[PDB]
């Protein structure tokens, strides 16, 4: 396998100015025409001139119009064009191709590609050469003249990046446009569109300058009353954006454009973002609520590119974090604001703590800039993104709001329309840091081990209180485990923010301060302290770490009580739940391996419980807050805590504790459960996709939360509120009814009513896949084979595959099989689908990360089927580097 290492980047020994394309696109073929006007860089030793080409079929190459031939001034192996380095010139030069492409057999969605009725391309990261030869690497910035021509009936709608200056007909009934892109850009960002598409349009005015900009959004017909909440959230990115960072959009028209056959989410191509549709379309009577934060935590990533990533783009692949953690972290910050609710930060920290924090204790373990890659496409990873803006966000703790706001312009200003490192924007940080601590000597050199340390620090705590000086003190360490990419792990720069509440009347005892600790270990000691307190530490979760509170079960309680901090108070439940969950698996864990004939479990704390009644019941306490409350925490969390992981002893543990609360509090949550409806189900607003109440949402979470464990209890008569939750008009409503329906005979009636309800629209039937595939049936595996020969078929959709197969690898007792047949199940359908969607097929993988955390026998079973894959012929480069870096071969 082919190998690229951070430290060897050089720039390259050529330049692209200007790029003149002309895509003819056919029934049958698209045509694509290229003029590369290029020139030698100061850094050209003269040597062969290659660029990237995949799959490309030549009909002519030439240079300053001689045109060159095959095996006498070139060579193409179907990946690189070689130019021989003696007819290449050494001035400005035209290097001009064509080719010919193949959109609708393009099923990897990579390139230029159909979907549905429409061609959309799509470049990030190596896609560009799928299309045209290029220097495909983003640190070859140019500019871009685009001609899209098609059959005017088909294909009436052609986009480019930029500002369409001409439409013309074409002989034949066809027809043309053309787009001048004036801001240089890498070949990443190229887009075009051609379809029958229908829009919504609004004009939007910038704050300072006062610029016309036209928004447009785009769908095929059938789906053009699912884009208006799209558009909203567009015109509130844009307003964020202007407010918080005083950035303005740059160009006279931006659109966004769905389509059904997507890769990933979205994409950011300038003044051209292109959408999956689930993270585009939705309407109130056809989409669940999830579906409304999706598309405003896409619209607005894909919208604060156009600074991070697009106006300030990466000097070459390593430094993907720099664009995709700051953008997170600007997405983030942004949806806090739009929903006002403490439950977004708690869905960032809980993705963070299962999904991240089980890579970084995998074998694909990785820093945020990693030292080395094959395939780019494989380090697209939560890793990247997650740990990223988690890295970005603790800037803004350290600095506060002002002087993070003063690094931030330092940086977009400075690099602004080029190319930048992750050091670049710590240098930033670093003058907003000497600004703040009124010291030019103070520098943040240790932030950047954020970059390249891998694995999650653990940071751990004592303390100790002098009741006659009235004086309190908090030791603290840190420490990361080696791995593969250190043996030595050094300090970070930690930054804890906490608080100190006082354990007799619920109060909060000094002015929230943010530690900051640097050493591998450091005692902070504060005076004027009362009473003894009970620490509020890691505030709004504020560093990316495993916390160790060495905090008693009655210290916690206390915090989930009374403590301001939503994180704190759902961190303390949390580790309330997991010392329960260690002790009970290991309880039953023992009792399975003795085959003991009686043994005992620890009960759940009966304050614990007495504490979520109390909120429960508390009128004026928050529904999202209490909606994360009642569950335990998520599989991928506790499996950091455990090795070796029996998963039927952990599904049996969870069942336990479940039913230890539940039977204390299911009246409760019935009570609450009735209660909630009327504020809950509430029909303002339900024609206004303009506008979203999220806490009225969560409303609705927190009763669908309820039923659930409701259900699950087989709760005297809940049957009957499971039938009319399913003529509820809200689609989060009627689909929980599937759901939970799992439990009773009525599941196939339920299955077979929501089916009808889900059919004509595709992103509904895609939740109504979700739906089936999650749920708790014993027979779940009989339901699978029944939406592959029903519902999924032949489909190559990319929402359709993983619709019908990830929720079902969630589901512990029954995908974890003892047989293996979960396992073998998925491996069959990765290894179908890498044959022509290789990305696709490496999402599918993710069951097995957590392989070597697994009991021995489910550890084999995994090996076995990874193996398996790994010998299929003509697997995938993106499926063989993933497989073979999880199983410690590379
Ligand atoms: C933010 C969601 C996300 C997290 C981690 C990794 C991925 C890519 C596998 C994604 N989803 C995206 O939609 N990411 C795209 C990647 C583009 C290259 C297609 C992106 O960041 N859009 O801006
Ligand atoms: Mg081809
Ligand atoms: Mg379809
Ligand atoms: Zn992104």
Same mark, same amino acid.
């Given at each position: 396998p082919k190998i690229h290492y951070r430290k060897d980047y050089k720039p390259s020994g050529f330049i692209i100015n200007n790029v003149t394309l002309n895509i003819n696109i056919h029934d049958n073929e698209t045509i694509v025409r290229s003029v590369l006007d290029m020139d030698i860089s100061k850094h050209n030793v003269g040597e062969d001139l290659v660029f990237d080409g995949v799959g490309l079929k030549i009909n002519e190459i030439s240079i300053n119009n001689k045109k060159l031939v095959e095996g006498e001034e070139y060579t193409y192996d179907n990946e690189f064009l070689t130019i021989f380095s003696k007819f290449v010139p050494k001035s400005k030069f035209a290097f001009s191709s064509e080719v010919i492409i193949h959109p609708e057999t393009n099923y990897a969605l990579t390139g230029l590609y159909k979907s549905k009725n429409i061609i959309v391309s799509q470049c990030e990261a190596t896609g560009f050469r799928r299309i045209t030869f290029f220097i495909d690497r983003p640190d070859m910035m140019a500019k871009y003249d685009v001609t899209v021509t098609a059959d005017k009936e088909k294909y009436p709608v052609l986009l480019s990046n930029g500002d369409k200056v001409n439409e013309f007909e074409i002989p034949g009934g066809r027809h043309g446009a053309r787009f001048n892109d004036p801001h240089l850009k890498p070949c990443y960002l190229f887009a075009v569109v051609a379809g029958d598409l229908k829009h919504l349009s609004?004009?939007?005015?910038?704050?300072?300058t006062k610029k016309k900009v036209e928004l447009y959004v785009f769908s095929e017909e059938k789906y053009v009353s699912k884009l208006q909440w799209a558009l909203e959230c567009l015109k509130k990115s844009?307003?964020?954006?202007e407010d918080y960072f005083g950035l303005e959009y740059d160009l006279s028209r931006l659109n966004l454009v769905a389509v059904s056959d997507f890769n990933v989410g979205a994409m950011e191509n300038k003044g051209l973002n292109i959408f999956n549709a689930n993270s585009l379309l939705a309407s109130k009577k056809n989409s669940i609520d999830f579906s409304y934060a999706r598309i405003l935590t896409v619209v607005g990533h894909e919208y604060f590119h156009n600074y991070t990533g697009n106006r300030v783009t990466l000097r070459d692949w390593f430094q993907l974090t720099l664009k995709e953690g700051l953008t997170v972290h600007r997405?983030?910050?942004?949806?806090?604001?739009?929903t006002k609710t403490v439950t977004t930060r708690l869905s960032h920290v809980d993705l963070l703590r299962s999904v991240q924090f089980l890579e970084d204790s995998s074998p694909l373990s990785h820093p945020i800039r990693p030292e080395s890659y094959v395939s780019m496409e494989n380090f697209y990873t939560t890793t990247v993104y997650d740990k990223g803006s988690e890295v970005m966000r603790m800037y803004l703790t350290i600095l506060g709001e002002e002087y993070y706001k003063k690094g931030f312009d330092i940086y977009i200003k400075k690099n602004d329309g080029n190319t930048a490192t992750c050091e670049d924007f710590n240098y930033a940080m670093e003058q907003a840091y000497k600004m703040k601590k009124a010291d030019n000597s103070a520098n943040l050199n240790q932030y950047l081990l954020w970059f390249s340390q891998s694995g999650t620090p653990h940071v751990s705590f004592?303390?100790?209180?002098?009741?006659?000086?009235?004086?309190?003190?908090?030791?603290?360490?840190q420490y990361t485990k080696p791995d593969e990419n250190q043996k030595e792990k050094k300090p970070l720069f930690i930054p804890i923010s906490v608080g100190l509440i006082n354990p007799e009347n619920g109060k909060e005892m000094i002015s929230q301060t943010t530690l900051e600790l640097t050493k591998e270990s450091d005692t902070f000691v504060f005076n004027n302290i009362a009473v003894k307190p009970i620490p509020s530490l890691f505030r709004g979760f504020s560093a990316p770490v495993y916390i160790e509170d060495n905090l008693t079960d009655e210290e916690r309680i206390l915090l989930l009580k009374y403590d301001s901090d939503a994180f704190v108070r759902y961190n303390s439940c949390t580790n309330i739940y997991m010392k329960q969950i260690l002790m009970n698996y290991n309880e039953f864990l023992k009792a399975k391996n003795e085959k003991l004939e009686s043994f005992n479990l620890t009960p759940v704390n009966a304050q614990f419980i007495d504490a979520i009644k109390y909120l429960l019941e508390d009128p004026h306490a928050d529904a999202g807050f209490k909606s994360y409350i009642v569950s335990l925490p998520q599989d991928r969390y506790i499996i950091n805590f455990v090795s070796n992981l029996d998963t039927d002893v952990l599904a049996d543990t969870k069942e336990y504790i479940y039913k230890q609360i539940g039977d204390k509090l299911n009246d409760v949550y019935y009570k609450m459960f009735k209660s909630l409806e009327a504020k809950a189900d509430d029909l303002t607003y339900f024609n206004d996709e303009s506008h979203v109440d999220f806490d009225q949402m969560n409303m609705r979470t927190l009763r669908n939360t309820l039923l659930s464990l409701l259900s699950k209890a087989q709760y005297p008569n809940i049957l009957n509120e499971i039938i009319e939750h399913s003529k509820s008009p809200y689609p989060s409503n009627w689909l929980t009814s599937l759901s939970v329906s799992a439990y009773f005979d009525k599941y196939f009636e339920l299955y077979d009513k929501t089916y009808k309800l889900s059919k004509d629209d595709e992103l509904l039937l895609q939740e109504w896949l979700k739906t089936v595939s999650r749920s708790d049936r014993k027979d779940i595996y009989?339901?699978?084979? /029944? *939406?592959? $020969?029903?519902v999924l078929k032949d489909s190559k959709n990319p929402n359709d595959i993983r619709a019908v197969y990830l929720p079902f690898t969630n589901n512990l007792r029954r995908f974890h099989d003892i047989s293996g047949k979960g396992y073998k199940l998925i491996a069959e359908v990765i290894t179908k689908t890498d044959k022509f969607n290789?990305?696709?097929?490496?999402?599918?993988?993710?069951?097995? /990360? *957590?392989? $070597?955390k697994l009991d021995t026998k489910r550890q084999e079973l995994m090996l076995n089927e990874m193996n398996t894959m790994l010998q299929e012929p003509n697997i995938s480069n993106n499926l063989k580097e993933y497989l073979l870096r999880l199983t410690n071969k590379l």
């Open positions: 609004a004009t939007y005015i910038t704050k300072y844009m307003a964020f954006d997405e983030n910050l942004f949806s806090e604001e739009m004592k303390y100790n209180y002098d009741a006659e000086k009235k004086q309190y003190s908090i030791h603290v360490n009989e339901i699978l084979k /029944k *939406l592959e $020969n029903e290789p990305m696709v097929a490496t999402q599918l993988c993710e069951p097995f /990360k *957590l392989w $070597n």
